[PDB]
Design an enzyme around this catalytic site. Structure first.
Site, PDB file in Angstrom:
ATOM      1  N   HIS A 113       0.799  -1.218   0.000  1.00 30.43           N
ATOM      2  CA  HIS A 113       0.000   0.000   0.000  1.00 30.43           C
ATOM      3  C   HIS A 113       0.836   1.274   0.000  1.00 30.43           C
ATOM      4  CE1 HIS A 113      -3.405   2.659   1.329  1.00 30.43           C
ATOM      5  NE2 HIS A 113      -4.070   1.804   0.570  1.00 30.43           N
ATOM      6  N   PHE A 124      -1.516  -1.603   9.904  1.00 33.08           N
ATOM      7  CA  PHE A 124      -0.492  -1.534  10.931  1.00 33.08           C
ATOM      8  C   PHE A 124      -0.031  -2.906  11.401  1.00 33.08           C
ATOM      9  CE2 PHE A 124      -2.773   2.468  11.131  1.00 33.08           C
ATOM     10  CZ  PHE A 124      -1.747   3.388  11.177  1.00 33.08           C
ATOM     11  N   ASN A 161      -1.565   7.615  -5.296  1.00 30.69           N
ATOM     12  CA  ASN A 161      -1.148   6.423  -6.014  1.00 30.69           C
ATOM     13  C   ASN A 161      -0.669   6.797  -7.416  1.00 30.69           C
ATOM     14  OD1 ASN A 161      -2.286   3.992  -4.178  1.00 30.69           O
ATOM     15  ND2 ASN A 161      -3.752   5.692  -4.186  1.00 30.69           N
ATOM     16  N   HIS A 186      -8.457  11.514  -0.204  1.00 30.54           N
ATOM     17  CA  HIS A 186      -7.544  10.421   0.093  1.00 30.54           C
ATOM     18  C   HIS A 186      -6.492  10.782   1.134  1.00 30.54           C
ATOM     19  CE1 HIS A 186      -9.226   7.745  -2.828  1.00 30.54           C
ATOM     20  NE2 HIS A 186      -8.164   6.961  -2.875  1.00 30.54           N
ATOM     21  N   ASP A 229      17.223  10.617  -6.831  1.00 41.49           N
ATOM     22  CA  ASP A 229      18.659  10.901  -6.795  1.00 41.49           C
ATOM     23  C   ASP A 229      19.228  10.833  -5.382  1.00 41.49           C
ATOM     24  OD1 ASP A 229      18.803  11.277  -9.576  1.00 41.49           O
ATOM     25  OD2 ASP A 229      18.246  13.391  -9.384  1.00 41.49           O
ATOM     26  N   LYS A 256       3.151   4.414  -0.998  1.00 44.76           N
ATOM     27  CA  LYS A 256       3.295   5.272  -2.177  1.00 44.76           C
ATOM     28  C   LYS A 256       4.310   6.362  -1.844  1.00 44.76           C
ATOM     29  CE  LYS A 256      -1.441   5.016  -1.051  1.00 44.76           C
ATOM     30  NZ  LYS A 256      -2.689   5.780  -0.771  1.00 44.76           N
TER      31      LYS A 256
END
Ligand SMILES: *[C@@H]1O[C@H](CO)[C@@H](O[C@@H]2O[C@H](CO)[C@@H](O[C@@H]3O[C@H](CO)[C@@H](O)[C@H](O)[C@@H]3O)[C@H](O)[C@H]2NC(C)=O)[C@H](O)[C@H]1NC(C)=O
Ligand SMILES: *[C@@H]1O[C@H](CO)[C@@H](O[C@@H]2O[C@H](CO)[C@@H](O[C@@H]3O[C@H](CO)[C@@H](O)[C@H](O)[C@@H]3O)[C@H](O)[C@H]2NC(C)=O)[C@H](O)[C@H]1NC(C)=O
Ligand SMILES: *[C@@H]1O[C@H](CO)[C@@H](O[C@@H]2O[C@H](CO)[C@@H](O)[C@H](O)[C@H]2NC(C)=O)[C@H](O)[C@H]1NC(C)=O
Ligand SMILES: *[C@@H]1O[C@H](CO)[C@@H](O)[C@H](O)[C@H]1NC(C)=O
Ligand SMILES: *[C@@H]1O[C@H](CO)[C@@H](O)[C@H](O)[C@H]1NC(C)=O
EC number: 3.1.16.1
Lengths: 412, 416
Positions: B128, B364, B145, B342, B135, B130
């Protein structure tokens, strides 16, 4: 290895104090059981009590309803001179008690337990042990109002010497703590330990049927190694339920009532877990009068919101209020339900403590836990009493009006 | 003994995806858009790029759509396809999908490296997380997402940290855990290799310089099986922020549910107990902002009510729950799985937490996620910007009480 079984023909009787005026569409009264136990006493009597107000002079009243209490105290005064060894443990009071002084001059032994200095609590326990054979365990204080003006519930076990000695162990803990220069030891003497607990309950014969019974004690500092803490016993009974949990307590509060304030979600989390995980039906019956903590309301609502068809959880909360008339409103500190018990489809718990953190961490208490694989017994009688109280017109939902309840109720 | 401090000129920028049609008053500090930040990071990338993602739907073809609003996402994809041929090393770890992903194939033949992490086999969860690492210097961490709807049709919140090499390498450690788990014959070790461990955690947070001011920042990860010895679990960090709050707690998450969403059913009162403890013991004002759409768990409602009932003058507790719903019109209702909020973050008077996980047990215990925690003893800063965003959303006409009617909300909301 399981401990030795007991072979005494133990007989359990539910006992209740129904306030004068309360009508229902029957168990023996607390006064009858106390009077019978006092009449049958021949060798010894041990009492753990909160306070002693048994006469009209104690409460500064002239109520005829005190008669039973006034009789009981008199019968107590008869115990010592006829050979019965009387030992009384009481919570440290504000002033000297006339009943305790009169019993002391009748030949009894009275010690005051200063639980506030020891564990920052009080001696809230209320039980009787008679001749190391019988015992009463319930919510009835040594109060005449506890016999005729306040609803009370308890259990009297007759002819069970083993369990009586088990309770005498806790009373001996109290009695030792009643000495002047005494403090809680890091480890209690081995004479205080018990082999009967949640893991290995005592095998008794209850009304001619095998049963598992044991006694839990609080606070944890007043618990020998083999004694199950009261909170552990309560939470085990809650967690083992698969069908329903019926709880009737005067006060339910998932915090430390008197403390910096602390949150205490132990019993609350257990009830929520039972409702959500195993779909256990939870009915919570809370007594309400003019002295109830208003902060009790919100937390109770926080449980009532869990009744939802999507979660399939079913938690219901009802308030039990004892109606009072013009005359009864003059009787001080009465017209309440002081019951403290829990019943599931498979277990019974009867305690001498309200449901809040202090009563399980700082304040002394004892509880009897019974399990039996029959079609009834003490568990069925407890369930019937709870159903009668719950369906009685004195139980109301949290949205009821305060006027049409019959008595002052802070929560409404 | 605190670890070595960091001297990189770290700069934190709040980034947001505001859905088309959502309107706000005059000032309402407007933060850069997620598309702008992604495009800038891709343009400035020169050595490497690491991406942790849930799914990949960046073009109209992936979602079977023809919306012009997908343009931003498609542009990002194009820039991604440009990274590898010019020398940038691209590594992509994604949750294992049911079928092949066109974006991943096109990136694969553009020169990128794509590995699928099968969290279902490992810990019964999903990838899940994201985040982007650019660099080994910059990194984005948020709720967006690899979706074109996440740029124009879904409200998203995240943070972009520029010029912070130390924190970027710390995040690359978690990324290395993900990348190793993408191998065929690989399983979670009992102890992770010492190259995966981190010296910066809740007890000893990394000393960074944020906008020319000292600050303490660290990264928490979940699940515990995907955590080296020195890595703080996400739940521990969240509960520390909750328990350390003395004035208020503002929470904005898409889903709040104190149980295990998919399981035998389990009860999970950890975050709920923390919030109740904060409200009762320390009198902490708790504001809970939950997104609602036509796919929200109805079982969320009752539990939320169970929190709103803690509002009482006798207890002095102050708990309020509001529902944030993104309005949709005739045209926007056709875009699949869009028109939502979201955001996944928490802000107190002294700390900031930005996560990529909804607030439920699985995220969790079984489901992978990362979170950034920042503390700074200034007057404003990142914490103040997060609080301002929360206040703007909370007071916006898109926030409603739990007893509001569904008709006058502008979108389908099962919770109402
Ligand atoms: C810390 O430092 C960073 C980087 O120096 C600051 O980021 C900058 O924040 C401002 C205000 O949020 C941005 O200006 C805004 O731009 C948007 C469009 O992107 C515009 O609509 C607003 O009206 C406003 O002009 C600025 O673009 C942004 N810089 C970058 C490179 O993204 C940050 O504000 C500093 N403070 C904090 C608390 O983070
Ligand atoms: C984050 O850092 C970048 C560069 O690391 C900042 O943008 C760049 O700012 C410098 C001016 O300091 C411009 O020249 C650069 O000089 C530094 C030395 O100071 C050198 O290391 C670089 O290689 C470069 O030559 C550069 O044109 C400029 N680049 C861009 C794209 O703006 C940036 O402002 C810092 N902050 C943020 C929020 O990005
Ligand atoms: C268990 O035995 C006790 C003792 O007999 C029962 O209590 C008696 O119940 C009857 C009514 O059935 C009363 O008339 C007696 O007065 C009760 N005894 C006393 C001392 O009060 C009890 O009911 C039995 N319980 C079960 C489940 O069989
Ligand atoms: C207890 O035993 C005595 C004598 O054995 C008996 O008279 C009495 O009835 C018993 N108790 C009960 C409740 O029956
Ligand atoms: C309105 O917004 C503009 C641009 O963000 C800003 O400069 C101005 O100060 C705002 N108005 C007020 C009264 O602050």
């Amino acid at each position: 290895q399981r401990p030795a079984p007991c072979y005494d023909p133990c007989e359990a009787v539910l006992v209740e104090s129904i306030p004068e005026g309360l009508e229902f569409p029957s168990n023996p009264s607390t006064s009858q059981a106390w009077l019978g136990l006092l009449a049958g006493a021949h060798s010894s009597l041990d009492i753990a009590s909160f306070y002693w107000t048994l006469t009209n002079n104690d409460t500064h009243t002239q109520e005829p309803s005190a008669q039973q209490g006034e009789e009981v105290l008199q019968q107590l005064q008869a115990l010592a001179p006829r050979g019965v060894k009387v030992r009384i443990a009481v919570s440290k009071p504000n002033g000297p008690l006339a009943d305790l002084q009169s019993l002391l001059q009748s030949g009894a032994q009275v010690r005051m337990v200063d639980m506030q200095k020891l564990t920052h609590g009080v001696l809230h326990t209320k039980f009787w042990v008679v001749d190391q054979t019988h015992f009463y365990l319930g919510s009835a204080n040594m109060d005449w109002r506890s016999l005729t003006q306040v609803k009370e519930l308890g259990v009297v076990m007759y002819n069970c010497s083993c369990l009586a000695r088990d309770l005498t162990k806790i009373f001996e803990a109290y009695w030792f703590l009643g000495q002047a220069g005494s403090s809680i030891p890091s480890t209690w003497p081995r004479s205080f330990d018990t082999r009967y607990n949640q893991e290995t309950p005592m095998e008794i014969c209850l009304n001619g049927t095998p049963a598992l019974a044991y006694l839990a004690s609080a606070p944890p500092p007043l618990c020998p190694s083999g004694r199950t803490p009261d909170l552990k016993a309560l939470l085990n009974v809650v967690d083992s339920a698969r069908s329903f949990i019926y709880i009737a307590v005067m006060n339910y509060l998932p915090t430390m009532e008197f403390s910096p304030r602390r949150f205490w979600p132990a019993i609350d989390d257990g009830l929520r877990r039972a409702a959500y995980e195993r779909g256990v039906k939870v009915r919570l019956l809370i007594s309400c009068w003019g002295h109830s903590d208003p902060s009790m309301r919100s937390f109770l609502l926080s449980l009532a919101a869990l009744h939802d068809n999507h979660t399939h959880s079913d938690i219901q909360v009802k308030l039990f209020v004892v109606p009072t008339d013009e005359s009864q409103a003059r009787i001080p500190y009465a017209r309440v339900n002081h019951n403290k018990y829990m019943v599931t489809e498979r277990a019974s718990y009867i305690g001498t403590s309200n449901w809040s953190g202090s009563y399980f961490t700082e304040t002394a208490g004892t509880s009897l836990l019974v399990t039996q694989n029959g079609h009834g017994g003490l568990r069925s009688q407890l369930e019937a009493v709870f159903l009668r109280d719950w369906e009685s017109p004195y139980s109301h939902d949290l949205d009821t009006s305060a006027n049409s309840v019959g008595n002052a109720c802070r929560l409404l």
